[PDB]
Design a protein around this nucleic acid. Structure first.
Lengths: 427, 15
DNA sequence: TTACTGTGGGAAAGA
DNA sequence: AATCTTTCCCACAGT
């Protein structure tokens, strides 16, 4: 019947890293539109990481059921921009199972939507569909801003993520992306880092304090790789024009905006900048023009843009399923009410279906489908959620509270970890 | 005002 | 060497 | 008025 069992749920929750399949879609938060016949490619290229040993297990099941029912267990993917006049494009192809990037996506001006997202659809080479997964939303822009209003898309808040790229003399082929690989920064033509950009608070350290707020030119900034947590030293972000760094006592009035060109100066030496030489990241010393301006080269000039991420996790706990794994439910929040036997929870999120049941740890609970953004259930009593088998997993050893992860489970056995934990110290 | 911990990678000097 | 095209600056037109 | 955004244009420097 393929219904999830408690024993199987317990094995999964204790061992997520060898079962759970992760699909992470990364992309910029804005795209410049194309007029006429032109194609202005999305940069950095939207990409997809398939993460987890679960992917290899999934291939194994597809391999072992290929011979009951060789390279028809190979991944095939497509991506498009949700438009019925836009071509779907074929995607390229540690715990990284596989990686693909879409390098030639664009949106024409004939497409009148203010926002769009990308739908990546995955298949096995034999025709078997895995499913369609959407990105976060992307705002269409006409061109980079030259202001001296919606800040959520145009400005860069401390704590958010950005991609940084180098391009020489308007040449697509020359594009290189700041990226960390092997515990060092470098520049790649296929991969790009999403870096957290922080306003430094106040000779340097591994531990530093940060500030909220928008990043302005002339701001001291810490860039931190979101994947490895490695950082660059403190850098002051500077506006650039045409191989010159503009140091004017007036650009500090200007907030850094999407698709602006900038330079990063070392805090110790005002003449030294972060610079790219043949995919190698270096310190390069500028030549002083005057007090308002420094001479650099196109190697020290970076375009900055805000990036986003859509992540989905699933496990086919009761064996390979006949239907697509998608639509993958997403849980944005839990809203709990009442105390004791009165206590209930509303799940808020997106892409719910009536074929889902909420599990508090390894305990399934009767679930009301209200809409695709609302599920409702009762909170099961502590005594039935934590027992002599599960005590070790659901007990906070510092405070003694009972904490259980919330999963959404489909009736054919696909478990979707929500990312959320229910604590009985609520209530 | 948060604290962050991140080991630093130093860009090698040019020559 | 010659045909063709992402990309960035600038002009023009609109808000 | 003045400034910004949107759309149109075209050359550069590559493939």
């Amino acid at each position: 019947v393929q219904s999830l069992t408690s024993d199987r749920m317990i094995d999964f929750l204790s061992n997520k890293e060898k079962y759970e399949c992760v699909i992470s879609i990364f992309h910029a938060k804005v795209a410049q539109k194309s007029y006429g016949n032109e194609k202005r490619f999305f940069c950095p290229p939207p990409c997809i990481y398939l993460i987890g040993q679960g992917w290899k297990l999934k291939k194994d099941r597809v391999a072992q059921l290929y011979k009951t029912l060789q390279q028809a267990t190979e991944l095939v993917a497509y991506i498009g921009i949700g438009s019925d006049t836009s071509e779907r494009q074929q995607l390229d192809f540690p715990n990284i199972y596989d990686y693909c990037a879409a390098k030639t996506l664009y949106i024409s001006d004939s497409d009148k939507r203010k926002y769009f997202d990308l739908n990546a659809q995955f298949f096995y080479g034999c025709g078997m569909e895995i499913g369609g997964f959407v990105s976060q939303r992307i705002k269409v822009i006409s061109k980079p801003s030259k202001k001296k209003t919606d800040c959520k898309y145009l400005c860069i808040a401390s704590g958010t993520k950005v991609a940084l790229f180098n391009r020489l003399r308007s040449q697509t082929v020359s594009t290189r992306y700041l990226h960390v690989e092997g515990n060092a920064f470098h520049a790649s033509s296929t991969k790009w880092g999403a870096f957290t950009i922080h306003l430094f608070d106040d000779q340097e350290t591994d531990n530093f304090a940060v500030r909220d707020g928008f990043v302005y030119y002339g701001s001291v900034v810490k860039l931190v790789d979101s994947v490895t947590g490695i950082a660059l030293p403190r850098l002051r972000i500077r506006k650039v024009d045409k191989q010159q760094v503009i140091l004017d006592a007036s650009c500090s009035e200007e907030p850094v905006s999407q698709l602006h060109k900038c330079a990063f100066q070392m805090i110790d030496n005002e003449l030294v900048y972060l610079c790219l030489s043949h995919d190698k990241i270096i310190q390069h010393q500028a030549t002083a023009i005057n007090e308002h301006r420094h001479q650099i080269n196109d190697g020290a000039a970076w375009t900055i843009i805000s990036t986003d991420k859509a992540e989905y996790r699933f496990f086919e706990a009761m064996g390979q399923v006949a239907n697509p794994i998608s639509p993958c439910p997403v849980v944005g929040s839990l809203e709990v009410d009442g105390h004791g036997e009165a206590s209930r929870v509303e799940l808020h999120g997106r892409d719910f279906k009536p074929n889902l049941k909420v599990w508090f740890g390894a305990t399934p609970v009767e679930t009301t489908f209200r809409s695709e953004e609302s599920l409702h259930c009762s909170i099961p009593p502590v005594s039935q959620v934590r027992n002599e088998q599960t005590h070790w997993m659901f007990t906070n050893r510092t405070t003694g509270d009972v904490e259980v992860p919330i999963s959404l489970v489909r009736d054919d056995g696909v478990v979707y970890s929500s990312g959320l934990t229910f604590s009985y110290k609520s209530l | 005002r948060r604290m962050i911990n991140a080991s630093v990678w130093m860009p090698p000097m040019e020559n």
